[PDB]
Structure formats: C-alpha cells, structure tokens
C-alpha cells in the first residue's frame, strides 16, 4: 500500500504574505518574519489562490510513515502564521514551599538568574534562545512571562529554565519546588 | 627483578611490563611553577657596582643571590635571574626552556 495522493491545504490570512523558495517557507507578518526549510521532507509546496492564498502540500506515492509528515508540515506552517500575527506567550509560575525563588532578569530579557532554589548558594544562569524575551510579571506575585515569534524557541526556553530547577537526591513527590509552565497563550488575544 | 613478565598467552612480552634500561635524561614538561622574584644582574653604576639582588625590604643587607663560595658546580650569577618555587628538571648548568 502506497497512497497515490495525500494533500492538505492551509488557509493564510490577509496579514501574512508567505513565499516559497523551494521547500523554504518565509512567512512575513506584522510581528516580524520567520523561516524554516523543509528540505528533509520530499513534498511539493504550492501557493494556490490569487485572493485568499491557500498553501497545499502533496506527497505522491508515500508509504505510511511518509504519509505522516504531511500534516506536521501543515502544523508547523500554522504555528508560523500564528507566531507572526499573534505570537507566543508562556506564563510560568514559581512553586516553592519554604525558600522563595528569586528570579532577576539580566540583559534585555536574554538571561535569567535564579538565586534561592531550595535555599542553596549556587546561582542558576540560563540563557534564552535568540529571539525570546523573558520578563517578570506584574499581574501576579511570581510568574515569568516570556514571549516570542517562534514556538520551538519559546518552548525550549521554558524547558531550559524548568530543567534548571530540578531537585536532586530527594523524593520529588514532596519537594515540588521549581518553575513550571502554567499556560501556553498568545500575545494579541483575538 | 620483576618475577613474572607475562602469562603464557599472549605468547609475547607486552610493552606495559617493567623492563630494565635507561633511567633519566628524558624530556619532561612540568607546569605551574610560580615566579617568586625576577632578579637584577650586577650593574656597575657609580664606578662601584651595586650588588644587592638578594635584598628585600625586610632584610636590607648588601648581599647578592650568590651563597658564600658560589653555587656548587655552577659558578656565580652576575646576570638577571628568575626565582621559581620548587624544583625543576635537569642538572646544574642545564638549559631550561620556560614558557
């Protein structure tokens, strides 16, 4: 079984004008621009319309494993389109039982530093990805508010600072301390 | 002696077993020797030479770095010198490369 054709189309709003340089999607919107190549996948990308501009992607004689990469491309393109019109925003709370975790942001949101995690002296310093700007909230008492265009960089920067606050050599069913991603939202809430 | 120089198999003496031969005169590079003093040589200044390069600001004696009778098997040090902490490779009069 190899399926003759499996396609999936993506609707593009009027804010963003994507281009196709082969298998490279350059999405360009109000919040900046983005770029990924999909040259590790054999698909054909084509812009369709003249007024609405869909984006199809076809596979042509794929087996089952190749047929899964079609909708992932569509999902990455849709996270590009959401990223350059709404943008990504992760709010993450700092959970502590006794020792208040003190986060102070270093140079222009590129570096955070974490002081008092489980009452110890070593200072965590974890650098954000290029493009992700972290911040300390004013809505609540202690949550970080980091945001950016690309989803795989905003999410990686939350994962670096969550794995920076790991409890070692203790039971982690008590000792629930750390900074954990509390919600995965957007800027410019539609 | 070394009593056993290998098992039956491998039917050969390995390169890792201690054997007799040359000791010393090997090139060696040792690190992290701290400089304690860069000493100044004998210079002739006002007709008579100032020779106090082993003086401190706590000793103030007019003595050179030379011990009485000179350095044994070497001679006397009239030039600039370096005072390193500890021991370094080679005999006396050995040329040392210090980087």
């Amino acid at each position: 079984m190899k399926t003759i054709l499996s396609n999936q189309t993506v609707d593009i709003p009027e804010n963003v004008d994507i281009t196709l340089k082969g298998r490279t999607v350059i999405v360009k919107g109000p919040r900046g621009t983005l770029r990924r190549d999909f040259n590790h996948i054999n698909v054909e990308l084509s812009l369709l319309g003249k007024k609405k501009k869909r984006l199809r992607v076809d596979k042509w004689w794929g087996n089952r494993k190749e047929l899964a990469t079609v909708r992932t491309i569509c999902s990455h393109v849709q996270n590009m389109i959401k990223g350059v019109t709404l943008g990504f925003r992760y709010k993450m709370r700092s959970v502590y039982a006794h020792f208040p975790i003190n986060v102070v942001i270093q140079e222009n949101g590129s570096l955070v530093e974490i002081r008092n995690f489980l009452g110890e002296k070593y200072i965590r310093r974890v650098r954000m990805r290029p493009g992700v700007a972290c911040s300390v909230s004013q809505a609540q008492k202690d949550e970080l508010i980091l945001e950016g265009n690309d989803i795989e960089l905003v999410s990686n920067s939350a994962a670096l600072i969550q794995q920076a606050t790991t409890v070692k050599n203790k039971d982690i069913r008590k000792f629930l301390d750390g900074i954990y991603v509390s919600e995965k939202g957007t800027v410019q809430q539609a | 002696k070394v009593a056993c120089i290998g098992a039956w198999h491998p039917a050969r003496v390995a390169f890792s077993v201690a054997r007799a031969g040359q000791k010393g005169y090997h090139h060696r590079t040792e690190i992290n020797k701290k400089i304690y003093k860069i000493g100044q040589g004998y210079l002739i200044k006002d007709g008579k030479l100032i020779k106090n390069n082993a003086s401190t600001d706590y000793d103030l004696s007019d003595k050179s770095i030379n011990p009485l009778g000179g350095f044994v098997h070497y001679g006397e040090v009239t030039n600039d010198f370096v005072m390193l902490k500890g021991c370094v490779v080679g005999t006396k009069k050995r040329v040392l490369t210090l980087r």
């Binding site: - | 009239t78 030039n79 009069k93 040329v95």
Partner: protein
C-alpha cells in the same frame, strides 16, 4: 615553515652553533647571506620576503639566541630557539619583530 629571514650581523657565539668543529672551520657561515642586506638586487628580495610573509603566514616565530659569554660556563656555543609571537595581527607582529 614558509620563509626564513636572518639579520645582517649574527655574532660569533651564535655562528658557533652551526658548526661541529669551530676550531678547524674557516668560519664561513652566513657570509654570502649577509651581503644581501647591503645590496640592491638582494635588498629588494628581502622586502618581498617580508611582504609575502605578511600576506600568507599565520604564525610568526622569532629566532633568538642566548649569549654564553655572560655565563660562567665552559660552553661558548649559544643555544638557538624559535620563540613565537602572540598578539595582534600578523602584519602587526611582523614589524614588531623587525624592530
């Protein structure tokens, strides 16, 4: 190694290094070489050998020697050494070394 340039006046304690028997030699080392520092057709060869060394080389090393006549030792033959020059660009560390 790309290109080597020597100075015009090398002293006898350094020229003694190039011989195994100084006493039987005619002391002829670097004698046809030194005349191209006082030439014109050989002079222009020297600054082509600096400027090509300025535009190709990445590592510069100066060739220096000790001066054994300040030492109380029996040896008169000096020790040559290549000591490399760190810091700056290659053109910057080259005309430093020519001074």
């Amino acid at each position: 190694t790309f290109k080597t340039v020597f100075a015009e006046h090398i002293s006898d304690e350094c020229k003694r290094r190039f011989y195994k028997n100084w006493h039987k030699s005619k002391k002829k080392a670097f004698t046809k070489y030194c005349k191209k520092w006082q030439d014109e057709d050989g002079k222009k060869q020297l600054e082509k050998d600096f400027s090509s060394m300025k535009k190709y080389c990445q590592v510069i090393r100066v060739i220096a020697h000790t001066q054994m006549r300040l030492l109380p030792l029996r040896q008169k033959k000096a020790h040559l050494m290549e000591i490399q020059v760190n810091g700056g660009t290659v053109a910057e560390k080259l005309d430093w070394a020519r001074e």
